[PDB]
Amino acid sequence: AFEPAHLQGIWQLCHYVSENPDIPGVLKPSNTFKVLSDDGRIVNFTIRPGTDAIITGYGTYRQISAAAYKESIEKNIHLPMLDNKDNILEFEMGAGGVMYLKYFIEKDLNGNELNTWFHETWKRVTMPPVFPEDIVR
Amino acid sequence: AFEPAHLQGIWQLCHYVSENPDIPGVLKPSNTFKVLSDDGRIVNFTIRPGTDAIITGYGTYRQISAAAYKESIEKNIHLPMLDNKDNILEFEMGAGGVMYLKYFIEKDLNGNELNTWFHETWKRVTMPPVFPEDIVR
Amino acid sequence: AFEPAHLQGIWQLCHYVSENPDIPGVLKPSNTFKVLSDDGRIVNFTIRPGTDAIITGYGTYRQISAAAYKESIEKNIHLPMLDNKDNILEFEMGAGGVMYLKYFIEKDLNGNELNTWFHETWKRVTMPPVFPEDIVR
Amino acid sequence: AFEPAHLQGIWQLCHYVSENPDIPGVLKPSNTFKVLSDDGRIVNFTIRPGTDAIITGYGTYRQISAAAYKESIEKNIHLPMLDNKDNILEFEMGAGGVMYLKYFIEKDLNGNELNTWFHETWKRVTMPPVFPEDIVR
């Protein structure tokens, strides 16, 4: 028995950036989005400036404990070793709409031992007060 | 009785672009996305390269006839005259995943006469065969 | 005898954009730059978001009359029929730093008759009052 | 006596990027360009996707030793403490067209102690074999 978390929404992948590799990267929003629907569907897609955005992964999802949810992946071109497999995302909600995710993958695409944790940082997409001027739809 | 159309998906706004305004614009994908969920929710959002993407409109939707669907808008910062109102989108599916939409707006935000048809072109976002090299997630 | 025009600078290519192809496109800045140096060198380059920008053309240039200048092109991957050839750009300076250019090309890459005028719109890149916040260098 | 370095060209600012801040950032090209002309002029400018690019700094430059060059800055909106001042850029040329720069700034804009070294990584912009398909000029 756990309280449902606020997973449903549109989430933007972030990354860490620095002009100097000796200075810790600062968090910046990037080009990938995860849609967690109210009806238990998950889709990841990546924008490609100047051309068509692409779906990179899809399946279903449900929260499984207080601090984790499961994605049941049908196909994933970013991480094809997850095709037709479950992946457990351990999550931590931070400030300003940030969600820190980690997930473990046992084997690589060829079935060899991988046993690695992967980390991602996401930020909830929300509606601002006004539609900005000089924005290109 | 009408058959349900394939509205559900993620749709990318397109525009028509030319270097020379005397030469008909070519269709190119842009920075806005419409999520039409399986459970009747609609969200529009616009990416802003270099910074956070923004939700620009949301509500519910349902198909109302063979060639039209309705968005029941809660809030829309792109078109605030549509807040807490319905908008009927007449649609036509074309080739290559393209959907042409048009909709009429009677009044502007202040209640003055507007009586304008607006036209949009959208393209269904799909999964390609492989995750491309030199893509920035 | 003609007065020298203000050609020297960094110029950004613009294009015409519309969400509705029946509405004349509005002028918007795009991804290509032309550097007209003080010492008579010309270089065109095109940015490719997410990856390396590319030089697309280079050579030398000089003004030849009140309303035209000549580019002496060494190599041009955008218009390879101009390799090791001169091209005369007829120019008209507009408002807000806009420069309208046109040029005639007699033959295509294979030597067949082309006899076509091409039109471009450019805008002078200048320094604003302040470095904007939320800009990504 | 030192041999002249290959400073002249168009240079693209790079940064180091990772999804997971524990994994060393990978070098990626960004949105700023430095034009080092054959006639000793320097201009920095930053592209702003969707809108007008901006000049961020300009002046003159000359190589002063085997491993350093000086920028004599007129105005710089990125680093306004450098207005009407010199800045010495220590440089190292690497592989694949990369140039590493570092420079010291003694005081901040108000004249208080800053005494900071700044590090930048730049990549020479070159002409590829063919003009790519699906590129937006």
Q: How far is CA D74 from CA B42, C127, D53, D62, in A?
A: 52, 12, 19, 14
Contact D87/A at CB under 8 A: no
How far is the first Cα of chain A from the last one, in angstroms, to the nearest whole number?
A: 43
> Is A17 in contact with D27 (CB distance < 8 Å)?
no
Q: Can you give the CATH number for the domain in which C40 is found?
A: 2.40.128.490
Contact B33/A at CB under 8 A: yes
Q: Count other Cβ atoms within 10 Å, centred on residue A75.
A: 14
Q: How far apart are CA D123 and CA D43, in angstroms?
A: 16
In order, the DSSP letters of chain B are --PPP---EEEEEEEEEESSTTSPPEEEEEEEEEEE-TTSEEEEEEEETTEEEEEEEEEEEEEEETTEEEEEEEEESSSGGGTTEEEEEEEEE-STTEEEEEEEEEE-TTS-EEEEEEEEEEEE----SSPPTT---
Q: How far apart are CA A47 and CA B79, in angstroms?
A: 24
Q: How far apart are CA A103 and CA C110, in angstroms?
A: 56
- B10 has which bridge partners? B35
> Is C13 in contact with C31 (CB distance < 8 Å)?
yes
Q: Which helix (H) or strand (E) holds C92?
A: strand C85-93
Name the nearest CA neighbour of A56 among A38, A37, A31: A31
Which of D28, D38, D126 has its CB closest to that of C55? D126
Closest-CA distance, A17 to chain D, in angstroms, reads 5
- Strand B68-76 relative to strand A98-107: parallel, antiparallel, unpaired? unpaired
Identify the sign of the CA torsion B70, B74, B79, B85. Answer: positive
Query: What are C45's two structure tokens?
Result: 């380059």
Closest-CA distance, C7 to chain D, in angstroms, reads 16
- Beta-carbon contacts below 8 Å between C and D: 110
Query: DSSP class of residue C60?
Result: E
> Is A120 in contact with B49 (CB distance < 8 Å)?
no
SS (H, E, C) chain D: CCCCCCCCEEEEEEEEEECCCCCCCEEEEEEEEEEECCCCEEEEEEEECCEEEEEEEEEEEEEEECCEEEEEEEEECCCHHHCCEEEEEEEEECCCCEEEEEEEEEECCCCCEEEEEEEEEEEECCCCCCCCCCCCC
CA B67 from centroid of its chain's CA atoms: 15
Which of D32, D41, D132 has its CB closest to that of C137? D32
Contact A31/C at CB under 8 A: yes
Query: What are A83's two structure tokens?
Result: 């095709």
Which of B15, B20, B21 has its CB closest to that of C19? B15
- D12 has which bridge partners? D33, D123
> Inter-chain contact D136–B17, Cβ cutoff 8 Å?
yes
Contact C114/D at CB under 8 A: no
Q: How far apart are CA B84 and CA B72, in angstroms?
A: 7
Query: DSSP class of residue C21?
Result: T
Q: How far apart are CA B69 and CA B131, in angstroms?
A: 33
Q: How far apart are CA D93 and CA D116, in angstroms?
A: 22
Range(s) of the domain holding residue A81:
1-137
Mapped onto helix, strand or coil, the DSSP state of residue A114 is strand
- C10 has which bridge partners? C35
Q: Which chain B residues are closer than 8 Å to A13 by Cβ?
A: 137
Q: Count other Cβ atoms within 10 Å, centred on residue A56.
A: 22
- Return the C-alpha torsion angle D108, D112, D118, D124, nearest 10: 20
Query: What are A39's two structure tokens?
Result: 């009806």
Length of chain D: 137
- Strand B41-48 relative to strand C26-36: parallel, antiparallel, unpaired? unpaired
- Amino acid at residue number A91: F
Query: What are A60's two structure tokens?
Result: 């279903």
Which of A30, A51, A131 has its CB closest to that of B136? A30
Contact C96/D at CB under 8 A: no
Backbone angles phi, psi at C8, to 5 degrees: -65, 135
The resolution in Å comes to: 1.8
Q: How far apart are CA D78 and CA C135, in angstroms?
A: 11
> Inter-chain contact C22–B119, Cβ cutoff 8 Å?
yes
> Is D27 in contact with D119 (CB distance < 8 Å)?
no
Q: How far apart are CA B83 and CA B57, in angstroms?
A: 9
- Amino acid at residue number A55: I
Backbone angles phi, psi at A17, to 5 degrees: -130, 135
Q: Which helix (H) or strand (E) holds A32?
A: strand A26-36
Q: Is B50 left (phi over 0), alpha (psi -120 to 50) or beta?
A: left
Mapped onto helix, strand or coil, the DSSP state of residue A24 is coil
Please compute, for residue B98, the number of CA atoms within 13 A of its CA located in the half-sphere on the CB side.
11
Length of chain A: 137
Contact A104/D at CB under 8 A: no
Name the nearest CA neighbour of C43 among D126, D134, D132, D121: D126
Q: How far apart are CA B45 and CA B107, in angstroms?
A: 24
> Is B16 in contact with B120 (CB distance < 8 Å)?
no
* Number of structural domains found in chain D: 1
> Is B70 in contact with B86 (CB distance < 8 Å)?
yes
Backbone angles phi, psi at C45, to 5 degrees: -145, 155
